């Protein structure tokens, strides 16, 4: 299930100038474009080698779009201050997520287009791509205005047409990096704790994509409660890492086995200490 998504954020800063405006684009949850209004020379920039193959009219057109969006968001941050009747001297946040998920054939599966104010839901386009869900009375104003203007049709034109179409092109031109598969390299470390028992830590390193499951068995039974587990984290080089640990008696370490499941593995790895 592929996807093309854009995450947009504007943060006001009273007495420090105009709001900081940012865009990030992702394909299959992997970052590839980025815009930062506070950058030395602000323009749309490549963030993966594969997108670099696009010509200069692509970067100019997207830079043109980004700088226009930044202007629409300057207005909106002001429109939001009055709806909620807030002081003008404080910092606020407007976030915008938009994109398309696609099933194997190629045509749309779900369209997204939702906004959040100060970290809370504000308005979101329903699955029908025809109506809007508002979170409070402020967003009800926005809803009827966008209803009167016909915002769903124009927004739906993007999601079903262009978004779907360009994602199809991004996957063809970037398949080698996007759809690559890096199997995790696994190993187990030993750690004698003061209490007298042991911590067995099972590491997974250098894998892509991100999804993975670490599980500790004992004589075939999963030990999902006594297990410790960090959130999957980025290595910094495009791959990911994760570890899972358990506490076991000294001497019986060879009874426990760690199981690593990843789409780069035809079969789950199994390892002991």
């Amino acid at each position: 299930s592929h996807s093309l998504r854009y995450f947009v954020t504007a943060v006001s800063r009273p007495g420090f100038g105009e709001p900081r405006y940012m865009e990030v684009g992702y394909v299959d949850n992997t970052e590839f474009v980025r815009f930062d209004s506070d950058a030395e020379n602000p323009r749309y920039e490549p963030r993966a080698r594969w997108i670099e193959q696009e010509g200069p009219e692509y970067w100019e057109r997207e830079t043109r779009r980004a700088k226009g969006n930044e202007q629409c968001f300057r207005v909106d941050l002001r429109t939001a201050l009055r709806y909620y009747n807030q002081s003008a001297g404080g910092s606020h946040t407007l976030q915008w997520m938009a994109g398309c998920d696609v099933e194997s054939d190629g045509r749309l599966l779900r369209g997204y287009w939702q906004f959040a104010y100060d970290g809370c839901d504000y308005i979101a386009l329903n699955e029908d791509l025809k109506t809007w869900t508002a979170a409070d009375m402020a967003a009800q104003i926005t809803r009827r205005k966008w209803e009167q203007a016909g915002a769903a049709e124009r927004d739906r034109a993007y999601l079903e047409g262009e978004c779907v179409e360009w994602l199809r092109r991004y996957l063809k031109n970037g398949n080698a990096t996007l759809l690559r598969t890096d199997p995790p390299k696994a190993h187990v470390t030993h750690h004698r704790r003061p209490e007298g028992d042991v911590t067995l830590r099972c590491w997974a390193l250098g894998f892509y994509p991100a999804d993975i499951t670490l599980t500790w068995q004992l004589n075939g039974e999963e030990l999902t409660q006594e297990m410790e587990l960090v959130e999957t984290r980025p290595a910094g080089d495009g791959t990911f890492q994760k570890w899972a640990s358990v506490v076991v008696p000294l001497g019986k370490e060879q009874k426990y086995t760690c199981h690593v499941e990843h789409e780069g593995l035809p079969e789950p790895l199994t390892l002991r200490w």
Partner: protein, 99 residues
């Protein structure tokens, strides 16, 4: 304010003394976006700290990747210190080479 950050301090490649690795500070699930991150070697701020992955998730909460070049030794010590409006005092997470 609202969402309190979560911090992990880890190295990119497996750590072994002398070899020049790269230390990562991973900060997630906070809000508002304004946040102050300092990476320390022996209680001394490191000057060249890069940023990366500044965005937010479906949660609406922000996350960011901060890293710097380093070289671990047996007696050295590293940590990441994060000042955010949702915490009364800054929070220091020390790098454990086994985590």
């Amino acid at each position: 304010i609202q969402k309190t950050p979560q911090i992990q301090v880890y190295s990119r490649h497996p750590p072994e003394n002398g070899k020049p690795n790269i230390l990562n500070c991973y900060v997630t699930q906070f809000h508002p976006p304004h946040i102050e991150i300092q990476m320390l070697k022996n209680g001394k701020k490191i000057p060249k700290v890069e940023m990366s992955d500044m965005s937010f998730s479906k949660d609406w909460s922000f996350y960011i990747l901060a890293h710097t070049e380093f070289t671990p030794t047996e007696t050295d010590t590293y940590a990441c210190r994060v000042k955010h409006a949702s915490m009364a005092e800054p929070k220091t997470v020390y790098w454990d080479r086994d985590m």
